[PDB]
PDB file of C-alpha atoms and ligand atoms in Angstrom:
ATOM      1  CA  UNK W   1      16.113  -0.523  -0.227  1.00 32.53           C
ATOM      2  CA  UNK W   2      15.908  -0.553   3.626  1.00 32.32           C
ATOM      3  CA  UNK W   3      11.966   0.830   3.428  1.00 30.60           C
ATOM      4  CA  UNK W   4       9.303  -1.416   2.933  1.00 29.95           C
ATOM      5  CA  UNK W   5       6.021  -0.840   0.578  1.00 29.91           C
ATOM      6  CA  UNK W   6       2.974  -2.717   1.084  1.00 30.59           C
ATOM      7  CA  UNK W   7      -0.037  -1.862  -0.682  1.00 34.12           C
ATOM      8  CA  UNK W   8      -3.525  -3.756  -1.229  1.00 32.41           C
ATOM      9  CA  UNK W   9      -4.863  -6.313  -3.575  1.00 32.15           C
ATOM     10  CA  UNK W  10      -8.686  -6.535  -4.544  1.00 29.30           C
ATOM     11  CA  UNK W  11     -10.618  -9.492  -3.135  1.00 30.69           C
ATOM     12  CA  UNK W  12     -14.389  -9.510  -3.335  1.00 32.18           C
ATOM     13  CA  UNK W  13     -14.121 -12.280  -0.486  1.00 31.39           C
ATOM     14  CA  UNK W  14     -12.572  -9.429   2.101  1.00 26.90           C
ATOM     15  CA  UNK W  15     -14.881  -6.596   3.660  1.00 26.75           C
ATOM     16  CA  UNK W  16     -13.592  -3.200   3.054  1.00 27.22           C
ATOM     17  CA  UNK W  17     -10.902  -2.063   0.964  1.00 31.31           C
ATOM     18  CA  UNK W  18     -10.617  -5.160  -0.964  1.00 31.15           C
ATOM     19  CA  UNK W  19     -14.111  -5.702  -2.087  1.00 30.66           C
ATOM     20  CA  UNK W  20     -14.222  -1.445  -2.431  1.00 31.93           C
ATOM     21  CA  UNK W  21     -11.583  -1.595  -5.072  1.00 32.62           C
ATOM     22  CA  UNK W  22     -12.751  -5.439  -6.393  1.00 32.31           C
ATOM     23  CA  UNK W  23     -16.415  -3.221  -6.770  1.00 30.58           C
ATOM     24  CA  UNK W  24     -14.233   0.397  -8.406  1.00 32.77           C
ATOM     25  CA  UNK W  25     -12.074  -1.917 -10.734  1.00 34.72           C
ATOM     26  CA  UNK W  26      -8.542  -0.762  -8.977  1.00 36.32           C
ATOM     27  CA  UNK W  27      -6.150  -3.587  -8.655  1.00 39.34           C
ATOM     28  CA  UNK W  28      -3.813  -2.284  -6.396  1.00 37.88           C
ATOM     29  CA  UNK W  29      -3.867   0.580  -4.154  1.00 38.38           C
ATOM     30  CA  UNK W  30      -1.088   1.610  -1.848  1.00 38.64           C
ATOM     31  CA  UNK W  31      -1.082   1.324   2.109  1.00 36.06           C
ATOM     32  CA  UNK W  32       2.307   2.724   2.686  1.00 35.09           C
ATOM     33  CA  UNK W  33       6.307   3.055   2.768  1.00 32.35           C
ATOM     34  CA  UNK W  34       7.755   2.574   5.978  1.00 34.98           C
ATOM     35  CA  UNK W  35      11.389   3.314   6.662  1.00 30.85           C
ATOM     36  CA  UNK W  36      12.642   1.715   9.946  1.00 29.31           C
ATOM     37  CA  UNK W  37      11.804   4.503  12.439  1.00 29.41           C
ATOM     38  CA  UNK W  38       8.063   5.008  13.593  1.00 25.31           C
ATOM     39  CA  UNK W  39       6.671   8.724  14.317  1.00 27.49           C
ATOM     40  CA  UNK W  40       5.870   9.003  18.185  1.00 28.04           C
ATOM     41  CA  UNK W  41       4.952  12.267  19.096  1.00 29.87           C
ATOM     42  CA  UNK W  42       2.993  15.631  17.022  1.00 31.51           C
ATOM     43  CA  UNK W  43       3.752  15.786  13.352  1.00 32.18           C
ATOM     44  CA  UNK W  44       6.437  18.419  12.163  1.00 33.80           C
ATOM     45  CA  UNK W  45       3.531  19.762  10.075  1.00 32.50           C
ATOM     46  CA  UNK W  46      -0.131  18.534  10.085  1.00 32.66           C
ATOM     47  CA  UNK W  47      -1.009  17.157   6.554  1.00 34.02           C
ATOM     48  CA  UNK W  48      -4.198  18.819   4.538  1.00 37.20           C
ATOM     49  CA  UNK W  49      -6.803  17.066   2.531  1.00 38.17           C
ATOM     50  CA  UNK W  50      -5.661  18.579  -0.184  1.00 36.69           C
ATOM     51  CA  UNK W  51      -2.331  17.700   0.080  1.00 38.75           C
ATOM     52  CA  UNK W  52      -3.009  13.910   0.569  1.00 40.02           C
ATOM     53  CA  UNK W  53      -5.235  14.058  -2.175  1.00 38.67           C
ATOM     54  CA  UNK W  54      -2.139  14.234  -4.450  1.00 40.90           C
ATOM     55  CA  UNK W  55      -1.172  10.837  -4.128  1.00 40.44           C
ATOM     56  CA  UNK W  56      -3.215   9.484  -7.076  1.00 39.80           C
ATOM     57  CA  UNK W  57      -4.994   6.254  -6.973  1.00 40.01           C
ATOM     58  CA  UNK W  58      -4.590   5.460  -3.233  1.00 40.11           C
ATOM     59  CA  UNK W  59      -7.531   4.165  -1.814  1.00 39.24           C
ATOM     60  CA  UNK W  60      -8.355   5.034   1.789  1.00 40.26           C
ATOM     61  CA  UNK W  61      -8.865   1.809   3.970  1.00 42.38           C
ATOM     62  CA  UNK W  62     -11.634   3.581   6.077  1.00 43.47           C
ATOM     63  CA  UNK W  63     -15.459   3.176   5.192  1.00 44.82           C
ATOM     64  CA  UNK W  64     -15.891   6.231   6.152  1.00 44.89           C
ATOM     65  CA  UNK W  65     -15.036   8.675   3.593  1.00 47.78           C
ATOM     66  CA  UNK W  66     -16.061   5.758   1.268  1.00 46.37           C
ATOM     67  CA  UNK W  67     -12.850   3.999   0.600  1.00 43.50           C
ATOM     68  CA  UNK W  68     -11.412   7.310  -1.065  1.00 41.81           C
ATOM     69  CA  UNK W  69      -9.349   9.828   1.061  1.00 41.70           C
ATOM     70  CA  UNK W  70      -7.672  10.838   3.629  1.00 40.90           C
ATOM     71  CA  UNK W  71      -7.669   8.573   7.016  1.00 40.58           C
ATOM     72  CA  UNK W  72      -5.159   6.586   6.007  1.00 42.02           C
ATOM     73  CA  UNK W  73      -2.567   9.030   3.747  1.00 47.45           C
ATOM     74  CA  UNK W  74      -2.997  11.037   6.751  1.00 50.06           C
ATOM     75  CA  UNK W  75      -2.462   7.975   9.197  1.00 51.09           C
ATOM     76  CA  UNK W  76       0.814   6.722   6.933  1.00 51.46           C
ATOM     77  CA  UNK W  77       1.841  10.547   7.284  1.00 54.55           C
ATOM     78  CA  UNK W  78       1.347  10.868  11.361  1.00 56.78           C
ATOM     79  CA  UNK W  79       2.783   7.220  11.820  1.00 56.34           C
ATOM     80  CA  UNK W  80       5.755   6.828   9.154  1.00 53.48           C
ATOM     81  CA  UNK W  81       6.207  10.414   7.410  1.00 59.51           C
ATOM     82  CA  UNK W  82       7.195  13.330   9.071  1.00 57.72           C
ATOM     83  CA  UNK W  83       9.490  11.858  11.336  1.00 58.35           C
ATOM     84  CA  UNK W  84      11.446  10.625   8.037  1.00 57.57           C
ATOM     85  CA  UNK W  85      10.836  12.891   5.217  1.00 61.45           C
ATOM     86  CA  UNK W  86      10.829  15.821   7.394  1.00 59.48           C
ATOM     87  CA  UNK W  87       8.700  17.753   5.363  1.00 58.59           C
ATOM     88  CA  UNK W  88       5.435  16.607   3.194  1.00 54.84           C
ATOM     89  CA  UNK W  89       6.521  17.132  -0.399  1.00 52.89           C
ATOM     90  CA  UNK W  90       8.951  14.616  -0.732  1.00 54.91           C
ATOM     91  CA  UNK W  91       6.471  12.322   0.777  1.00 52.66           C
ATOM     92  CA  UNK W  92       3.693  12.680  -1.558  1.00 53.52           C
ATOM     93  CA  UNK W  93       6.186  12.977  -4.508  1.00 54.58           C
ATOM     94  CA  UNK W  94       7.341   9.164  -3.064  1.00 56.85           C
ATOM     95  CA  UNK W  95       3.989   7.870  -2.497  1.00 57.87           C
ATOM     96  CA  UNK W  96       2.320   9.253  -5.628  1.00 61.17           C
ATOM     97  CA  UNK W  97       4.772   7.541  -8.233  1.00 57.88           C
ATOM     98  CA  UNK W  98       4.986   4.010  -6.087  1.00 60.60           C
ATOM     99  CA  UNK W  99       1.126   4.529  -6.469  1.00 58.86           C
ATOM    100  CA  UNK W 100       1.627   5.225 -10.071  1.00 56.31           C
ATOM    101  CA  UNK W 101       3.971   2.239 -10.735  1.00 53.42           C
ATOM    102  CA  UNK W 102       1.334   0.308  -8.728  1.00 52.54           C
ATOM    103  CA  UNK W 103      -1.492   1.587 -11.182  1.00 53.46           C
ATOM    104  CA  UNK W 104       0.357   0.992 -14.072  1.00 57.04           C
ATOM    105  CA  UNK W 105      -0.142  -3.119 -12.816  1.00 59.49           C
ATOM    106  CA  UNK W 106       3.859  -3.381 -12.585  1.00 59.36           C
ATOM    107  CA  UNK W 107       5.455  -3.016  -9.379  1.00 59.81           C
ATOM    108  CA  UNK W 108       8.939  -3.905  -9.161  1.00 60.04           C
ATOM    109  CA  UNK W 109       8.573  -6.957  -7.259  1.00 58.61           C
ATOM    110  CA  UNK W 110       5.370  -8.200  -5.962  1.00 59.56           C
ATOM    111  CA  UNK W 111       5.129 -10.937  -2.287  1.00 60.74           C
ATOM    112  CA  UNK W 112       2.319 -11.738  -0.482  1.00 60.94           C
ATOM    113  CA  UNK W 113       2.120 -10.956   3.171  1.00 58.97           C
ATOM    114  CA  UNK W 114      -1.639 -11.822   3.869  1.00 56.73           C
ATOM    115  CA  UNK W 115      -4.451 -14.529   2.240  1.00 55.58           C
ATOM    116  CA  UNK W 116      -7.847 -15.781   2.114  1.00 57.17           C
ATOM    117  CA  UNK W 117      -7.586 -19.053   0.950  1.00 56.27           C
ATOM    118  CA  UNK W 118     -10.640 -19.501  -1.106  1.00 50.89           C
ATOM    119  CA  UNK W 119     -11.731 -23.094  -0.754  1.00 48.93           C
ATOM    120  CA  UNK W 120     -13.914 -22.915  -4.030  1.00 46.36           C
ATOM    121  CA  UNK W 121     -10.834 -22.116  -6.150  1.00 44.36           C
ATOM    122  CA  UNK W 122      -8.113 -23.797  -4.002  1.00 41.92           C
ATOM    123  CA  UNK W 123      -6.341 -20.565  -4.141  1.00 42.97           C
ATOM    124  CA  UNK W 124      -4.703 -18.240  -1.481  1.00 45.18           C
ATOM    125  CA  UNK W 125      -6.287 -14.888  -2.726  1.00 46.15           C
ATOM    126  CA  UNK W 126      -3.910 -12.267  -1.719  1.00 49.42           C
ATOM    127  CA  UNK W 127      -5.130  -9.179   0.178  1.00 48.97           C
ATOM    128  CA  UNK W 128      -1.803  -7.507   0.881  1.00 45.76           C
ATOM    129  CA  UNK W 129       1.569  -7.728  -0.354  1.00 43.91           C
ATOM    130  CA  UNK W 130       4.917  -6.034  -0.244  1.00 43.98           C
ATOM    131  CA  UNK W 131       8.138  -5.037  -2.590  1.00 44.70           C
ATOM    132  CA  UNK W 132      10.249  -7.990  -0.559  1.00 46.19           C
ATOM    133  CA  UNK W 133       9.730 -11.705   0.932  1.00 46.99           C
ATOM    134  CA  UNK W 134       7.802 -11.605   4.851  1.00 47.87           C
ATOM    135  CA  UNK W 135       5.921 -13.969   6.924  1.00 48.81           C
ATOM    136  CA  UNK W 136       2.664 -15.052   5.591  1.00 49.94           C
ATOM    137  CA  UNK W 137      -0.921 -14.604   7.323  1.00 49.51           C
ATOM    138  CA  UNK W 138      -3.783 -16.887   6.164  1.00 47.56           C
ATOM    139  CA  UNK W 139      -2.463 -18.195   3.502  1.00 50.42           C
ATOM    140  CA  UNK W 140      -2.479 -22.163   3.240  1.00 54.78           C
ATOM    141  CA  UNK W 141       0.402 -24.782   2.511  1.00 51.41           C
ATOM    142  CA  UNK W 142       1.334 -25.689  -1.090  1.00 51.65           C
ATOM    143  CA  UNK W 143      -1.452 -23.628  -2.034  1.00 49.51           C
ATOM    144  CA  UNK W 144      -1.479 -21.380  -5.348  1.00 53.10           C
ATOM    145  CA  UNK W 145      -1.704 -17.526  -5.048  1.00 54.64           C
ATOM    146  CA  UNK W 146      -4.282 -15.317  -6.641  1.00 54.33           C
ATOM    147  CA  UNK W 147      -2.280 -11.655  -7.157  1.00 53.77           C
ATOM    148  CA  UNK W 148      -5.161  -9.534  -8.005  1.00 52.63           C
ATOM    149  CA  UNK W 149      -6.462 -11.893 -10.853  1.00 52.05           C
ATOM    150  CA  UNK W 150      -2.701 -13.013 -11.826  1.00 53.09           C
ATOM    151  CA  UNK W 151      -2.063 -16.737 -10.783  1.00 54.88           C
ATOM    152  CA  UNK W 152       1.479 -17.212  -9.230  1.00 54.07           C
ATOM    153  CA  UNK W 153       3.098 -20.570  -7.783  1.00 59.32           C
ATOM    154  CA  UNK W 154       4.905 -19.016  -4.969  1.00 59.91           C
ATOM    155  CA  UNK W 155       4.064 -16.469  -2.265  1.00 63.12           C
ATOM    156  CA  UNK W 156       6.846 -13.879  -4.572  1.00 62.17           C
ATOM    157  CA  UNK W 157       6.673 -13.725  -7.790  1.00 60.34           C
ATOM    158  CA  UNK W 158      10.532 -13.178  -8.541  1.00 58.25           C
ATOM    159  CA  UNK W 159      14.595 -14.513  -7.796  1.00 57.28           C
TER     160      UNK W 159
HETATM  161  C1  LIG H   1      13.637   5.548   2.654  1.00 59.36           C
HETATM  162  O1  LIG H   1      13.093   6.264   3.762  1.00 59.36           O
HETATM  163  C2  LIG H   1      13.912   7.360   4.208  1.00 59.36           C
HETATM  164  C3  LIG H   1      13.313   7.850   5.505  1.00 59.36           C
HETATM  165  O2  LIG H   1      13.815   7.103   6.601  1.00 59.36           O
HETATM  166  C4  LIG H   1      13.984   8.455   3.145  1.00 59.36           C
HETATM  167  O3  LIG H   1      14.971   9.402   3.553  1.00 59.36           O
HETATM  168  C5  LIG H   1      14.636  10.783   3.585  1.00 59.36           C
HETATM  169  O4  LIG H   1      14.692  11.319   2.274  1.00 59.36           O
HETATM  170  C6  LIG H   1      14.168  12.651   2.214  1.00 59.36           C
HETATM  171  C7  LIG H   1      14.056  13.011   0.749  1.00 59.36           C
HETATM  172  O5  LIG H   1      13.182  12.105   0.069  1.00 59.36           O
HETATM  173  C8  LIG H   1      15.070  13.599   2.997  1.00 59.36           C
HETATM  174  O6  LIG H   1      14.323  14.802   3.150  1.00 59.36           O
HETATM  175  C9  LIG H   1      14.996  16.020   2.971  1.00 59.36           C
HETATM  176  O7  LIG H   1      15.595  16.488   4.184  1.00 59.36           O
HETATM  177  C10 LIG H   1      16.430  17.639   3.960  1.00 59.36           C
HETATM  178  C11 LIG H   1      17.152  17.921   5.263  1.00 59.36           C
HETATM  179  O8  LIG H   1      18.013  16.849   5.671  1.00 59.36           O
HETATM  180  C12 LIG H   1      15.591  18.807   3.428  1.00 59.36           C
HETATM  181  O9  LIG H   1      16.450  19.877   3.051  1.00 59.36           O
HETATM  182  C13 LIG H   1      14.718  18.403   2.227  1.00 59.36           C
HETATM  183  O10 LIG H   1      13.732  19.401   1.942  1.00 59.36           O
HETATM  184  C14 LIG H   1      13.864  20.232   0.778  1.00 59.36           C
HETATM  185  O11 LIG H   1      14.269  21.558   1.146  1.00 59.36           O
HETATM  186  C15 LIG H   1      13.228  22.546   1.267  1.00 59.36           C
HETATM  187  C16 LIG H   1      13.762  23.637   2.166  1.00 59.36           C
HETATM  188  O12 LIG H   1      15.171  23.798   2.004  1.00 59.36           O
HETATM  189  C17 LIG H   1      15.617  24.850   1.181  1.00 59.36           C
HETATM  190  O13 LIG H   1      14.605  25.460   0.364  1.00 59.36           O
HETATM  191  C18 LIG H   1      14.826  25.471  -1.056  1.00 59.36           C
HETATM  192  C19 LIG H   1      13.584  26.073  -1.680  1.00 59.36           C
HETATM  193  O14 LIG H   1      12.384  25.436  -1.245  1.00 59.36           O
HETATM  194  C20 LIG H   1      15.130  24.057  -1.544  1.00 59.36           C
HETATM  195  O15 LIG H   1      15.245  24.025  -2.966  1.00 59.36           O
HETATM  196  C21 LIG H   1      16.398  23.525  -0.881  1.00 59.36           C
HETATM  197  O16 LIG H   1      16.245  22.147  -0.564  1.00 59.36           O
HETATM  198  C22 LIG H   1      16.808  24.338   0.351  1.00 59.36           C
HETATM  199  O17 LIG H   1      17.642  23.560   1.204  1.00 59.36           O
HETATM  200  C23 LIG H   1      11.937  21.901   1.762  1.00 59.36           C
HETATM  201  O18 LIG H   1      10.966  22.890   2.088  1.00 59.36           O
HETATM  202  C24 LIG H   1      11.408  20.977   0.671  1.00 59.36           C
HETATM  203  O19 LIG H   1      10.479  20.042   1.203  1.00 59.36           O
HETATM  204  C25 LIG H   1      12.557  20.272  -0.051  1.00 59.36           C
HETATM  205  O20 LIG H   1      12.169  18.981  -0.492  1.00 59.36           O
HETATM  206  C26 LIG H   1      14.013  17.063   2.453  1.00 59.36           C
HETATM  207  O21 LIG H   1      12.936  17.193   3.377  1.00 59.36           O
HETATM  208  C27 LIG H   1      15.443  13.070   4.387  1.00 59.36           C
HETATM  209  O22 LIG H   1      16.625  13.720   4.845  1.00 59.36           O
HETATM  210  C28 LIG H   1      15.667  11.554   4.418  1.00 59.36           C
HETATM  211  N1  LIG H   1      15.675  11.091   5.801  1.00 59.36           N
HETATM  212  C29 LIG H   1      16.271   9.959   6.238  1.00 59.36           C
HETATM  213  C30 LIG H   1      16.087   9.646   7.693  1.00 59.36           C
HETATM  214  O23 LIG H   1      16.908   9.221   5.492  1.00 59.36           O
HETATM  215  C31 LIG H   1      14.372   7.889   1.776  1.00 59.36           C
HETATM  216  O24 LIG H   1      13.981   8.814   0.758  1.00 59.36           O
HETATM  217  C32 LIG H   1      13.665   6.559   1.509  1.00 59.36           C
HETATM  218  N2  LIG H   1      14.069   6.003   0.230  1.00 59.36           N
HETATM  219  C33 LIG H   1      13.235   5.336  -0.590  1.00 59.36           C
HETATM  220  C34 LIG H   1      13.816   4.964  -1.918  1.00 59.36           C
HETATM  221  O25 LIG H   1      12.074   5.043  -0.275  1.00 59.36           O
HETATM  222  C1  LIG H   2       8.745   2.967 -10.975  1.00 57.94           C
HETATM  223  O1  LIG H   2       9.048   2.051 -12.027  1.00 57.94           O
HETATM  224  C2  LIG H   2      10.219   2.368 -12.796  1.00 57.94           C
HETATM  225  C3  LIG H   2      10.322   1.300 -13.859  1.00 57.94           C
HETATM  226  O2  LIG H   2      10.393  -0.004 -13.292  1.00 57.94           O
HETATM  227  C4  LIG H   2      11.436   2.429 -11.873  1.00 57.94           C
HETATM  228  O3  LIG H   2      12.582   2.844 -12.616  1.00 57.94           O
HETATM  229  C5  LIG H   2      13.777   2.055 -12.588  1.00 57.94           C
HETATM  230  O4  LIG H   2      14.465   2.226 -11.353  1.00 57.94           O
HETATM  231  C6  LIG H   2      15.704   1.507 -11.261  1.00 57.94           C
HETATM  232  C7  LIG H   2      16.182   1.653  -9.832  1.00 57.94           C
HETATM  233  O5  LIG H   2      16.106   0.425  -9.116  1.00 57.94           O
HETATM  234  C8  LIG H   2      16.694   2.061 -12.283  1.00 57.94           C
HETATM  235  O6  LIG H   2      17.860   1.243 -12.272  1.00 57.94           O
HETATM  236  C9  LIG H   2      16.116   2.044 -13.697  1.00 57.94           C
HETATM  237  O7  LIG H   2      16.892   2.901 -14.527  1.00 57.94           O
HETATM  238  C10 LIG H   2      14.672   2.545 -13.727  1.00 57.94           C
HETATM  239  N1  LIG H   2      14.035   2.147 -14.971  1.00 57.94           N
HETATM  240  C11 LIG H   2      13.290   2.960 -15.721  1.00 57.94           C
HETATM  241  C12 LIG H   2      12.708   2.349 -16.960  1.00 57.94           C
HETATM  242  O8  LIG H   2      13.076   4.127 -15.405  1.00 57.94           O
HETATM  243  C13 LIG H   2      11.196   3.419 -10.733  1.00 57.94           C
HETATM  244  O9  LIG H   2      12.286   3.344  -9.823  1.00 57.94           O
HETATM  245  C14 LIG H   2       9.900   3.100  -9.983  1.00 57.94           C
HETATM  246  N2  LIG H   2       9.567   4.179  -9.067  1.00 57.94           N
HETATM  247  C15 LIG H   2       9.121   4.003  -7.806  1.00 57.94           C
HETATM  248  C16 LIG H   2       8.834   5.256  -7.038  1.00 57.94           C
HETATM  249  O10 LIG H   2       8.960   2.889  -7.309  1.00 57.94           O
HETATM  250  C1  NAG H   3     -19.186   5.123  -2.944  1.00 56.73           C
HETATM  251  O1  NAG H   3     -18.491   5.169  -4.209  1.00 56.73           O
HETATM  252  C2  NAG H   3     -19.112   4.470  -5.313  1.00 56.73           C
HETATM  253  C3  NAG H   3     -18.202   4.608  -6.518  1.00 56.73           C
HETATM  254  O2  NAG H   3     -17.544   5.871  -6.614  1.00 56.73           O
HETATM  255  C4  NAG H   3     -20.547   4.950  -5.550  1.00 56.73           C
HETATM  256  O3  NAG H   3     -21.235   4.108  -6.477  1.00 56.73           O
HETATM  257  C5  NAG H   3     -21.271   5.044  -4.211  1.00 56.73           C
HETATM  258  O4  NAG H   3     -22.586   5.566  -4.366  1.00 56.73           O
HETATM  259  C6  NAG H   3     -20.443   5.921  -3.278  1.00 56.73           C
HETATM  260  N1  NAG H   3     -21.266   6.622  -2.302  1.00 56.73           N
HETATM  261  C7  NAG H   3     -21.871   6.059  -1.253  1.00 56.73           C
HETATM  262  C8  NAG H   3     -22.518   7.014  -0.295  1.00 56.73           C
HETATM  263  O5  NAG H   3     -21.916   4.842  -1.095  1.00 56.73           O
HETATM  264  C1  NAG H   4       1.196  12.120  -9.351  1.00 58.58           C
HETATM  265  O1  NAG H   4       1.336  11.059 -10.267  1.00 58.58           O
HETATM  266  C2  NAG H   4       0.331  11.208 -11.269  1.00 58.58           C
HETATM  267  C3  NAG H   4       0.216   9.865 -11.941  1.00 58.58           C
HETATM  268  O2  NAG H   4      -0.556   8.987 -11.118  1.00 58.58           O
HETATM  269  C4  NAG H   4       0.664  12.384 -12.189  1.00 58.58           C
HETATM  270  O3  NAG H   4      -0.555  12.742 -12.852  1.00 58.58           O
HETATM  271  C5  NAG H   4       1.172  13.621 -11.427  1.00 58.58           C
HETATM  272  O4  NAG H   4       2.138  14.289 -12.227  1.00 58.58           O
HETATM  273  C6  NAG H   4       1.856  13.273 -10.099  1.00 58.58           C
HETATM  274  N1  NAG H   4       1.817  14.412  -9.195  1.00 58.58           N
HETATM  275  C7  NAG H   4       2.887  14.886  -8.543  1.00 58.58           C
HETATM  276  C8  NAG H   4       2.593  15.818  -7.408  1.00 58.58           C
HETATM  277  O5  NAG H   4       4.037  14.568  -8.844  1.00 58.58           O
END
């Protein structure tokens, strides 16, 4: 309850991700779960390609291994993991079926955290967005949202 989950949205209008998954079909692809503590310091154990690889469906943010793996996973493990999970199992176990539930189209609760309003469509096309309510980023007043194709009144879409 007291860990956050953002995770990406595809957007044609955004370079990188967005327009990588927008181009690959995906509709959502996970960025990460952060608990409240970050990970200063060397890892408890250094994460392996293969390893990270496990989380199916997540979408690397970097261009450089083509928007597929590892940067990130091993970025959201250095930053977030270790630290909190202590060891990497749990972790991908956790990321891989918030990644599922993501690829199955229903997470739990979806809520915008950044836009691009698209003045052609008069629609705050959402990049990012997270399992609970936050502060918005680019995303225009009284403006309708675009979740990944799904058209939504409010910046939530629950409660
Ligand atoms: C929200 O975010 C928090 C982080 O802040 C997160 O809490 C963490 O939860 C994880 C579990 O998901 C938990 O990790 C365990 O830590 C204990 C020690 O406290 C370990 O024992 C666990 O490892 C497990 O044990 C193996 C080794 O131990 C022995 O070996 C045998 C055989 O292998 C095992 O069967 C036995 O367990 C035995 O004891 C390890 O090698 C394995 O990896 C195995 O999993 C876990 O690593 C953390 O303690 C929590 N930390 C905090 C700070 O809360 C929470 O899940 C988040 N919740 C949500 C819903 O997102
Ligand atoms: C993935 O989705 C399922 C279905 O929405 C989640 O399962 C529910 O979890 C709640 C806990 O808040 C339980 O009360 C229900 O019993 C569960 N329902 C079903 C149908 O299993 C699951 O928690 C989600 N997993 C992750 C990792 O987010
Ligand atoms: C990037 O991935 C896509 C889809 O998997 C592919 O069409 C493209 O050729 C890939 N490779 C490079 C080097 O761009
Ligand atoms: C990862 O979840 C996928 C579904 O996306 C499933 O094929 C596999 O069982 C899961 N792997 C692990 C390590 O639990």
């Amino acid at each position: 309850s007291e860990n956050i989950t953002q995770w990406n949205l595809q957007d044609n209008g955004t370079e990188g991700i967005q327009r990588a998954m927008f181009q690959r079909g995906v509709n959502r692809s996970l960025k990460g779960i952060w608990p409240e503590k970050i990970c200063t310091g060397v890892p408890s154990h250094l994460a392996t390609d293969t390893e990270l690889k496990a989380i199916h469906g997540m979408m690397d943010a970097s261009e450089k291994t083509n928007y597929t793996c590892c940067r990130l996973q091993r970025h959201e493990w250095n930053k977030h993991g270790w630290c909190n999970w202590y060891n990497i199992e749990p972790w991908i176990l956790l990321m891989n079926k918030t990644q599922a539930n993501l690829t199955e189209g229903q997470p739990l609760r979806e809520c915008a955290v950044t836009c691009r309003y698209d003045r052609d469509s008069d629609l705050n096309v959402v990049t990012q967005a997270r399992d609970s309510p936050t502060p918005l980023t680019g995303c225009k007043k009284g403006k309708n949202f675009s979740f990944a194709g799904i058209l939504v009144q409010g910046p939530c879409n629950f409660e």
